[PDB]
Amino acid sequence: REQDIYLPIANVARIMKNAIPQTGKIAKDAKECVQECVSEFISFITSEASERCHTINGEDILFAMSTLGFDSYVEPLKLYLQKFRE
Amino acid sequence: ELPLARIKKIMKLDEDVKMISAEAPVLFAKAAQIFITELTLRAWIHTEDNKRRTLQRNDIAMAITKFDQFDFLIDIVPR
């Protein structure tokens, strides 16, 4: 139903708008494209984390992120999860 | 912001992933935000290069080909 395989367009869009100048605009098609990229990003990492042992946990995801070339994300993410649970 | 329930659904599209820890979607919500941010900023480079203020799908296709970290998206948004 699209609501079953993608993040909500407006939420994706809000993140993109924050990334570009205030004067910038984003085409509907580009919002939809990022929508697709983000789903692939989740699935890509998840698939790797799935083959980390043998429950997929936060540590599995963090390692997969390191394995697959997203090492820059690890520390920010650990700091985030820390604030999150505190 | 981003909805955890929906992140979980995406993770659960894969047949092999059956059990997910509660933290895992939280991590993805933030990671997806960081990823959207860097993809968008890299796409914007090409937006400006074509003298536009509107970011388009081809800008994302271009930025994907310029960064080895985005190699996994080549099938998703072909230049």
Binding site: I5, E32, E36, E40, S43, F44, S47, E48, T67, L68, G69 | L13, D14, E15, D68, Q69, D71, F72, I74, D75
Partner: peptide, 29 residues
């Protein structure tokens, strides 16, 4: 192509083919 991602890219091609071969995602959209 990125030596870190190569194997996992191949796997995800096959996973996407399967979901397609079902009806859980479309060919294009």
């Amino acid at each position: 192509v990125n030596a870190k991602q190569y194997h996992r890219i191949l796997k995800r091609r096959q996973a996407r083919a399967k979901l397609e071969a079902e009806g859980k995602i479309p060919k294009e959209r």
